[PDB]
Design a binder for these strands. Structure first.
Ligand SMILES: O=c1ccn([C@@H]2O[C@H](COP(=O)(O)OP(=O)(O)O)[C@@H](O)[C@H]2O)c(=O)[nH]1
Ligand SMILES: O=c1ccn([C@@H]2O[C@H](COP(=O)(O)OP(=O)(O)O)[C@@H](O)[C@H]2O)c(=O)[nH]1
Ligand SMILES: [Cl-]
Lengths: 391, 373
DNA sequence: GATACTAGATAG
DNA sequence: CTATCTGAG
């Protein structure tokens, strides 16, 4: 009903899914007639702060020394949406003032908390999440069976209702901006996008390239594999690769019989353009079923929306439920290739078929785009969330 | 016996440690009967070029358009000492001519290369380091032979050492640069929690402006900034924030330090970069007559030149600043500020220890012998 | 195969 | 502070 919305990332602007969600959320609220202020605590900085285009509208605030500025911001809205909380690495002043903010927000402001993390390992790396949840008037999580719901919430309430949510994207806009004529897509390029955490399936991508793609003369690119501590393991296993920074992308060896070409971190818009011209995009996220309900990740949606053939993790499609009828995603003729770890041959065979038949290729991606649109477009999902928020 | 030495700073004259080493090296060679020419590439300019007194003899050359001039200079010596190489921010003409230079000097010239960098991050900003190693006849590193950047400690004392009666015990002077391992955050902290409340004053010289100040501000650290122009407007009275000087003239700082109760050099060098090498700012404190306050782990990681034992295992008169127990550090400082006799006793100790550890008379002799045979 | 997941230092 | 590089809990 035409309200003022303050979207708050108290952990900081990290540049990944929480930042992307906040940006898509802002867009939806603006598109639907509401006013939005996007605020983030800058007490902690992150590598991917520039990955998304937010600087022309985001408002940074140092919780440690600008409590007053933060307080006026969060209190100048009708609905306060908190998508992240301070990390366990911040100084006492930061968590102290954050907690102080929670206590001094007008009682009338509707506080909505979205928990974006899955594993308890990540959930524990938060400070003030308990007081955040206690002040929340509405709470969303990615799964009724996840650690947030089954571990933390039971720990705090031995209780408010926790609603499920999917992180939506304006899939129409992405396509309108990057979709390419199939004739301009290089069937030899296989592009994986993700992060350096085991459940993103980087090991499986290296394995698939070594056993099927490389031998078949194809090229593999992996974007987003930052050299964080987790990357140490890739070095210890002795996996072959060629690493490139963001200022040396054009110096990437995209010829056959080459190791996987790795990119550190990417600018979202630049990646979408490269992907729109890539034969196959890979998103191998493979979370434990307990974390899956209806949520695909932004990288899943980005593949389908930009026009490449999406290659997803089978068990992920099997354990996720289509938004329209709650049926497994794998039960639909979506055009998506469900990467099978125990049978990569069939996976590569499907890829071969598509690579040699532009018509079949085009038909299949059109199916993927419409399937993904129906499943997680902002026009549907944010409306569901809005109804729950204003319930 | 006497020889012609050309000291070449191909990166340019930055005005810090490499520049200081080059000038001290020139002094030692000249002092020991050798002819010296000091050459530097002016392709890249720097802020602290005038920090050290070199204009009366230094020879600038633009590698990009004075190759012939450069070639005749570096070829006009018996020993060529290369103390720095071109930065990656130089135009192709600069590095191209530098490599060409290495390939055209007489094969008979002894080329000595000194690697002053510590972290690999500083190394990756060096060009032509490949061909430099190839042409090099002798190579030195801080931690291939090891070396310590020596200074003529006795000469500094002789020029600035003041009677304890002339020293202001309330002044705490930190010297360094705007890079976290120089320990400026610890100095700010120490002033806030111990020095300021005790009515003491703190001056921090060398903190050049940089993006790091964005972080200093965000942390809400109080400070008053001064350019080398209005050093006269510096408020040294009690109850003041740390007083910062952006850049300093070496000779001027030594004079200021010689009259300061305590000098601080809080560089924290990971044990990997530490072997025997202290920095010039370390030596400068002990040489001008102030009480040196150094970083504890730095002294624990470094080995004394005389017997290879940790510096901290000696009764050196040096106050080892302990981030984990700053109160004890402050109590040590108070103790010395109260008894001028004890104060004099400790610095005399510091001077002799530092002299024995890294005076040019010892270190440059050691390096010359390595260079010779 | 914890492939079960997720800093610290230094230069400009 | 951001970008970049080493190599952990
Ligand atoms: O270096 C990177 C890494 C990620 N992203 C984007 O950040 C979002 C990450 O959301 P997702 O839920 O897919 O992954 P996660 O939040 O778990 O990293 C997606 O829009 C990615 O395209 C980006 O622009 N650059
Ligand atoms: O603004 C400044 C900064 C430094 N120095 C001098 O430059 C040298 C720096 O060498 P050091 O090894 O102490 O540290 P670096 O700056 O080379 O890492 C010392 O003689 C300092 O006194 C100076 O004269 N002015
Ligand atoms: Cl220098």
């Amino acid at each position: 009903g035409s309200m003022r919305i303050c979207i708050f990332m108290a952990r900081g602007l990290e540049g990944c899914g929480v930042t992307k969600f906040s940006l898509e959320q802002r867009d939806w609220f603006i598109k639907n007639g509401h006013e939005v202020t996007l605020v983030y605590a800058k007490d902690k900085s992150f590598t991917r702060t520039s990955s998304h285009d937010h600087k022309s509208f985001s408002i940074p605030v140092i919780l440690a020394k600008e409590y007053d500025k933060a307080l006026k911001l969060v209190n100048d809205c009708d609905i306060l949406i908190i998508n992240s909380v301070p990390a366990t690495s911040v100084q006492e002043a930061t968590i102290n003032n954050y907690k102080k903010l929670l206590d001094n927000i007008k009682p009338s402001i509707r506080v909505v908390v979205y928990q974006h993390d899955h594993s308890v390992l990540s959930l524990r790396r938060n400070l003030g999440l308990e007081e955040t949840v206690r002040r929340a008037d509405v709470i969303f999580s990615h799964s009724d069976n996840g650690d947030f719901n089954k571990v933390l919430m039971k720990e705090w309430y031995p209780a408010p209702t926790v609603y499920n949510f999917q992180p939506p994207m304006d899939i129409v806009k992405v396509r309108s901006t990057y979709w390419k004529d199939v004739s301009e897509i290089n069937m030899n390029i296989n592009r994986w996008i993700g992060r350096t955490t085991t459940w993103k399936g980087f090991y499986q991508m290296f394995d698939f390239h070594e056993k099927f793609l490389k031998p078949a003369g194809k090229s593999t690119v992996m974007e987003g594999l930052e050299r964080s501590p987790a990357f140490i393991a890739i070095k210890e296993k002795g996996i072959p690769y060629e690493y490139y920074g963001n200022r040396e992308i054009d110096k990437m060896n995209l010829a056959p019989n080459q190791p996987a070409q790795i990119l550190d971190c990417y600018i979202n818009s630049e990646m979408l353009e490269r992907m729109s011209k890539s034969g196959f995009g890979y998103q191998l996220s493979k979370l434990n079923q307990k974390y899956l309900q209806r949520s695909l990740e932004y990288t899943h949606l980005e593949l389908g929306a930009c026009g490449t053939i999406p290659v997803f993790w089978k068990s992920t499609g099997e354990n996720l439920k289509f938004r329209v009828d709650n049926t497994p995603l794998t039960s639909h003729d979506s055009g998506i290739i469900w990467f099978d770890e125990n049978d990569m041959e069939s996976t590569f065979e499907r890829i071969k078929e598509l690579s040699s038949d532009r018509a079949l290729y085009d038909r299949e991606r059109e199916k993927a785009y419409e399937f993904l649109y129906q499943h997680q477009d902002s026009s549907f999902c944010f409306k569901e969330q809005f109804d729950i928020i204003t319930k």
